[PDB]
Amino acid sequence: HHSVFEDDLPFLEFTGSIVYSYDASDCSFLSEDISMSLSDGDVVGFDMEWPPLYNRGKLGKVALIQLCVSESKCYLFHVSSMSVFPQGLKMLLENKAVKKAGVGIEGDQWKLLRDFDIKLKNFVELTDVANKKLKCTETWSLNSLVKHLLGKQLLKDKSIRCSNWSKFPLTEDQKLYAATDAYAGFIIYRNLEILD
Ligand SMILES: [Eu+3]
Ligand SMILES: [Eu+3]
């Protein structure tokens, strides 16, 4: 048996516009569209994905970068398919003017630096924002925050989450999964920030 708290909740599924980009210049220009829609201090949900196979002692190289900039739009930048890392995206990620929210984001910063020599700037660990605004001291996960704040759980098909993110093109399922994780980061920040 199990408590109500242990019940399976509805899955969180982003239903807004998912912009898929797999070319460097397209990506850079898209990053500028993002910059035109935001103002200093604004926060976007952040996440990234990498293939399952290990490479020379480390995790597969980052293949996808996701940015949810509003409740109705999320970008999927398939960098593994790009000839060069998009300059517009590098500057957006290194821009202190835009805040990037997520869980375990400090670890993303490290991997991003190792993989592309990019310095993620002005990121916020959602775990700390939650403990701060919810007035608690918990060890959160993106899933537990989605559950606590939204009453939903994250899609969990392991064959999708641990799929070959570097395989082009991404499947509709991969796109849904990746976009939704960044969307979660965006919504969680927004809902927490509004708290008095
Ligand atoms: Eu992640
Ligand atoms: Eu993810």
Side-chain angles (χ1 to χ4, degrees), residues 62-111:
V62 167
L64 183 72
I65 290 175
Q66 306 98 260
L67 298 179
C68 178
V69 309
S70 75
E71 61 183 3
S72 69
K73 180 172 292 299
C74 185
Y75 295 77
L76 301 193
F77 297 135
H78 209 356
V79 298
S80 56
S81 290
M82 297 174 199
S83 59
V84 301
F85 193 100
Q87 178 68 191
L89 178 57
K90 166 177 182 173
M91 302 194 284
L92 178 50
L93 296 177
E94 293 186 345
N95 190 178
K96 299 184 178 183
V98 177
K99 186 177 299 182
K100 300 81 178 181
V103 170
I105 197 159
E106 178 172 62
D108 295 321
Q109 176 198 191
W110 171 77
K111 183 157 177 55

Side-chain angles (χ1 to χ4, degrees), residues 13-140:
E13 284 178 44
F14 179 67
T15 61
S17 172
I18 295 174
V19 183
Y20 180 50
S21 172
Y22 53 79
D23 295 304
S25 189
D26 172 37
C27 182
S28 286
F29 275 110
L30 251 26
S31 293
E32 286 195 356
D33 296 342
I34 293 179
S35 288
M36 295 187 274
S37 65
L38 305 177
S39 293
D40 286 0
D42 288 0
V43 188
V44 303
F46 177 93
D47 204 357
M48 47 186 224
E49 314 298 336
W50 53 81
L53 286 178
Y54 285 82
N55 178 60
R56 301 178 67 74
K58 61 221 171 190
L59 287 168
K61 185 178 177 183
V62 167
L64 183 72
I65 290 175
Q66 306 98 260
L67 298 179
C68 178
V69 309
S70 75
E71 61 183 3
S72 69
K73 180 172 292 299
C74 185
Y75 295 77
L76 301 193
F77 297 135
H78 209 356
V79 298
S80 56
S81 290
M82 297 174 199
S83 59
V84 301
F85 193 100
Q87 178 68 191
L89 178 57
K90 166 177 182 173
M91 302 194 284
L92 178 50
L93 296 177
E94 293 186 345
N95 190 178
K96 299 184 178 183
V98 177
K99 186 177 299 182
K100 300 81 178 181
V103 170
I105 197 159
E106 178 172 62
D108 295 321
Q109 176 198 191
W110 171 77
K111 183 157 177 55
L112 219 48
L113 188 65
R114 283 287 303 265
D115 291 355
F116 303 104
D117 189 39
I118 288 167
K119 298 180 175 185
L120 183 61
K121 212 68 65 178
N122 191 184
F123 51 92
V124 297
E125 169 52 46
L126 252 5
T127 294
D128 300 319
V129 186
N131 281 163
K132 177 59 181 181
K133 310 227 64 178
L134 265 26
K135 297 179 179 177
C136 53
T137 306
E138 303 292 320
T139 59
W140 307 95

